[PDB]
Every structure is written in structure tokens, then in C-alpha cells.
Amino acid sequence: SRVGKKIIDIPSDVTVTFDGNHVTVKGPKGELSRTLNERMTFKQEENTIEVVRPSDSKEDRTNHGTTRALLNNMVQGVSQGYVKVLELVGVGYRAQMQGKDLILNVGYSHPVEIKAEENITFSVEKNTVVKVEGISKEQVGALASNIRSVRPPEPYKGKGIRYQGEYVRRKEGKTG
Amino acid sequence: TKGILGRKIGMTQVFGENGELIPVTVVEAKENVVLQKKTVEVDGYNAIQVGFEDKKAYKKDAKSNKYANKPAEGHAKKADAAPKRFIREFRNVDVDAYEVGQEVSVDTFVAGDVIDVTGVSKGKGFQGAIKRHGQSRGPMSHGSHFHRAPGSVGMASDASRVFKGQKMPGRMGGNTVTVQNLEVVQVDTENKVILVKGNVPGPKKGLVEIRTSIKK
Amino acid sequence: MKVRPSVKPICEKCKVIKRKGKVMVICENPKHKQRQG
């Protein structure tokens, strides 16, 4: 597992501390704690961390890769954070902030309210660009996915909520 | 959530604010007293036990249920109440809002309250499948010798038996029935009566239990 | 989704995967989505 073998750089402002399997990373933006695979060892260097698997079995290789990726994600999340940007397409499709919660008006007979979660921030720009900011890459992805699933992009005019870089397949509509 | 016990007096009608004819059942609910308070600590669940309709005091050679026996008299005297004809528990109320020995007046309910009413339905005795289970008759003519019989009770070798739940002649009525979402049309505190919209199970003089409707 | 015993690439972009014990084909072309069954 090349991903597992790869070493994780720790920014000076980020501190990683292990408690058996459980690990916790603190940084400027917040704190992230989780339990990693119990069979993976950690070489905790002063400026870097390395993940070591005990064997070369299938399970060990897979878990080595995933453990390294998750720990790197935690470190980069505390350091730089993660952001996902969605945009609204369609005339009248708008978004706005009701304090911390996000209210969307997308072609339904009712507005849709999305309640903000801990460690997550919503920001609306131009009434048509929502962005979710957090330290948890997983949480950011999950909430962006929920916002998109309120009304995902349709193929005939591209209307709905999409990730800003998302490619939307398009189909011709009416034909003779 | 509220509860009270009464006797079914009979049905009548009242004219509503727009002149609509409202069928009503008159329920006399005097002499309700909280006899016991059951709790999770002592009993494992919360409920108030209510006793309804004073009966006579204990006497030596009593021959009917009109006179309280010694166990019942002691039970009621513990609540400082006269012994009661009917005793039922309400689990749907907040026990902390009641005191043992307290009266439960018809005024606990107010007009417009939606209620569930429980009683024992009228008995019909031994009844056949047409009446008891609402089955269809056979032909009354065209040579038929099948009028009110219950019809086939099974199939054949498979299964060489009658399944449980087969509907057959037997005793009819006299079952506990709850009618949901009736309404309190009126409360008459002078007469200790509640006018309930519609009809409720049981014969006249039958015991009925009124509770705040469970569905909301 | 195509549900059939014969699951296999239909174009060069089709990708054979295994999810929850089931052989599947995923593709950029939705017509090519397959699930063995």
C-alpha cells in the first residue's frame, strides 16, 4: 500500500496525540478525534507521523491505506479545513441564511430548511452559490450531499442544485 | 390527559350553534374519588385509581354487592372515601396532579375536548355466523338447504383440520370496546353529567370510562 | 439499471466492480449500469 507507506506531514500548529487506537488532532481550526484500526502502529516523529502495518495480508494492506488516508485527512482538516461549493441553476432558485440555518427556494411549493450542524458553516453568495465549510471532510461531504439532494440537477435544462465543478449530462428535450 | 368514570343514562339530541342536530349520550359521572396513587417505585407504573358511585357501608350479614365488604371498606377508608361501586385505573393522566382522596368532578373536561370512551358492549347471547360475523346467507329458494349455516370450515386432505380463527357460532357482544375521537358537547356541573357527541358501547346504566383521546 | 446474469462492459468506459457480494458495471453512460441477478 503506497498510500499507507506515505508519511504524513504535521504543520507546526497541529498537534497529534494517540491514546491506544484512539487518536486526536488539534489545530487552529478545531479538534478532531477518532478511533483508528487497532492493528496499525504509529511512528510518531517530532514533525511527521508514519503508519506501519504488522503484516502484508489483504486486510492489513487495505486498513493501512485507509488509516493513513483518514489520519492525513484529519491533519489537513484541522490545518486548512475543507469546503464544498454548490450552485443553484434555474430562474427563481435561490438560497439564503436564516441565521445559521440555510433556507432554499427551489421550484417547490414550500421552502426547504437545512439546519446547520456543529463544526459546519454555511455561506450564501449572490443568492445562488452555497458553500459548506468545516474541518471534517466527511461531514462537509455529507452536508453538501444533503443540500444537493434537496433537488439534484435535471438533464433537460440543468436546473437544480449542483456541485460547482460538477459535469451535468444534458439531453435534448422536446422532439418532433 | 384526563379521565373519569360514569354511567350511561341514554341518548338524546341537542341543537348546535348553527341549528345542526347533534346526537348525544348522557353520562352521569358523580362521586368520582381518587382512591390510590400507583407509582413506578411501588407498583412499577404510574396511574391513578378512581372509584365511582358510593355504595353502602359494611354491615355484618351482607348478602349483595350493594354493601362494601371489609377489604373494600379498608381500601376506600385509606383514601378517606366512602366505598365505591366501580374502580378503574387511568394510566394516561399525570399522577402528580392528583391527591389520594381527591374528587374528580365532571368539570375536569370542557366542551370541545376530544375523548375516547370505553365500555362493555351489549350482550347478545349465543349467535350464528350471519349475525355474529356478518356472513352471507345461502339462497332461500331454488332448492337450497343452506340458509344461515356458516359455510365450509376448511379445504380437504390438505389440511385435514380447521384453522384457528375460523368464524363460527358462539356468544356475541359483552366485549370491551373503545370508541375513539368522540367530543364533549356539554358539561353540566349541577347535574354531574357529560353530554358526549354520538353513541357509546353498553346498555343503559352501563359503566363507561372517558379519557382524553390517545390520538392527537 | 440492467439486472441480468451476464454483466460485462458494453463500452470501453464501463468498469466492473463488486459491491455487497454483487458483480456490477458502473459507467459514465447510465444505460450501462448493470447488476448481476
Next chain:
Amino acid sequence: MRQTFMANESNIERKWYVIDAEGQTLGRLSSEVASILRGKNKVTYTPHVDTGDYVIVINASKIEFTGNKETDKVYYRHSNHPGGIKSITAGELRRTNPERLIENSIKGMLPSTRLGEKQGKKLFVYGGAEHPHAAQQPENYELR
């Protein structure tokens, strides 16, 4: 010449044991407990009388399964009413009634005889770490 000893109620001594389900496999713990209940571990074993001991099983909620039995082992029962099949997975039953899980596992390993029913009545199962039978002064028993 007939000389085989026969146990009877005058000379049978039934002791009380406690067995900890925690970290134990359902079936393996169950077979060993069943032997104990039947008295198969006594030199005075006598088939027509109960020479077994009493068993308390604690931490039933921490009994464990192998494979995918948690979601795939299904317990079926029938109410003797048409279409009256009801089912519950081993995992759900462990969550909601671990005592019943262990009891049924063990009792399925005892004979369906009057004596087997009686012997199965000597089992007491508890989901947690406590039991109410200190008065019987049970001894810890090590499996295997």
C-alpha cells in the same frame, strides 16, 4: 452379577455454579452448560434421575457470534394461526432479550423429556453482571 450404582434423591447433591458469557461463543458455552445441567460431569451420572447442577449465566448480553449470524441467523416461531410465522434475528434477540437467546440455545441441547424440561429449569440467565442468587452461594466455573 449386577453391581451398578444408581443415584437417587437421597444421595444426589446439586451445587450452584456461575458462568460468565462475556466473550464466549453462544453455541460452545451452550453445549458445556447443557452438560453441566444434565450431570454428565459427575461419576454418579444416572440417566433416570437429575444428577445435574444449577447454573447461572451472567453477561448474556455480551455473548458473541461468528460470521454474519447477527443479521443472518433467524429464529422462526409459529402461533398456530394461519400465516402466523414470526421471525427475529439473532442480533435483534441479543439486543432485546439476551437471556432468552441463551436459554433457548441451551434448552435446545437438552432432551425433550419430562426430565429434560426439569433439568432445564435449573438454568438462570441474566443480561448484566449481577444475579439475585447470592443465597445459594454459587461458585465460579471455568469453561472447558
Next chain:
RNA sequence: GGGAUAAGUGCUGAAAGCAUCUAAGCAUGAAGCCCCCCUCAAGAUGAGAUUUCCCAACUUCGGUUAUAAGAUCCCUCAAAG
């Protein structure tokens, strides 16, 4: 209305530097499943719980006794049959 799910939909994610809903992990998702609603139910022989009532004489001193609380016989009845 709640919990867990099906077909599905995804998030994060390696095995396989990419990709990937899946392996670990995390969501979501049916008139269906378990409940919520109604009825029966401790012969549930695993026979459960709470409140109240009765409580002595005689004994070959193991035990017995008619009585207690209570319930019936018989009788007047119906909302019950």
C-alpha cells in the same frame, strides 16, 4: 408518528499512488419489518405486581378444629343468559 431495513441514492475510503457507495467507518431510503392504535392475556406450572381484610383454642404438641375475613346453597330478578 418512531426504530431498523429492501431495491436504490450517496459521503468518506483503501485494497489497486488513479478510480471506486464498501472492505473498515458514516448517512439516507418503501403501503412492507418492529412499534405506535384496538382486543385477549400470569395454566406466562417462568403460575408476576399493588392496596385492603381475617389471625385461636385444643393438642398423641408432627397435628387438629369448627370458625374468621370471605363465598355459596335457597329465594326476588336482568343491563346477563
Next chain:
RNA sequence: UUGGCACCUCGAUGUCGGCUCAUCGCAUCCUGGGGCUGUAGUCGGUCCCAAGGGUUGGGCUGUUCGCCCAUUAAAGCGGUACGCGAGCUGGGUUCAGAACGUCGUGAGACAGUUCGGUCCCUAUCCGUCGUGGGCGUAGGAAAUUUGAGAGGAGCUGUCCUU
């Protein structure tokens, strides 16, 4: 399903259709949830999950089928001795009468037709629906109860507004 075989039943295992009462499977007719679409929308097509419930009256014919009229969200397909005659019917069909066509010298005959034509049984056991008595539940009693389990229910139209 049409058959093949001839293994249970010829000191009898009543046979079509209907009626009454259902019950189960799911390969789903409607309703619920989904993928793909040569899915603009309204409609559809096809496939997947799903058996909770629901799934109509009439004309003709013994009919089952089937066609037709009028509805419906829909008018599912199958098993249960082609479920059910000690529950009903008895129109068809394979007893005796009579007749036509036909065949036969004839007596008669025909998976040709026609008119008529005896459906017994007081439930012992299991099973099922109701309803009592005994004993048990470590004193004898009156009331109130928990809920292990079990049963019930579970369907859908149309219109207004957006």
C-alpha cells in the same frame, strides 16, 4: 396444461360448474419505493424492491372459458383431492322412457343431438367456535393490575390550493 407410467384406493378415495367459507405462493393487477428510457410536461415503456391491504355489477351460455354492456385505483396469476356435496345446489355429464340425424339386415349403437328423470346419515375421536367445573399458583380472602405471548386493523377516489 395436453400427455407418459400404472405405485395407494374397485368388501366405493362422489365426478363439472355455481353457492357459502376461506386459506396460502408471488412469477405483482392497484396502491407504496426505486434504476434506465428513443423520460420536455401530462402520459407512457422496461426492469428492480415490495404479498400490508384492496382487487365490480350486469347480457349470453350448464357452463369453466370467452365475447359484450357499464364501471373501477385495479378489475392479478396460481396452489389448497382442478380447496370446500357427512356445508348447499344439481343446470352439464355416463341408468331405466321417448324422438331426430346417422350407422347397422337386426337386436341395437353414436366424446352426435333432443324433452324427462329419487343428492341418505341423530358427530364417537381429533380439529374448530363458545361456555362451565376441578386442582395448581406454600395461609385464607376482596378488589385493582404488569404484559411474556397472541389476535385485530392495515384499501383507495375525486375536488380545491400551490
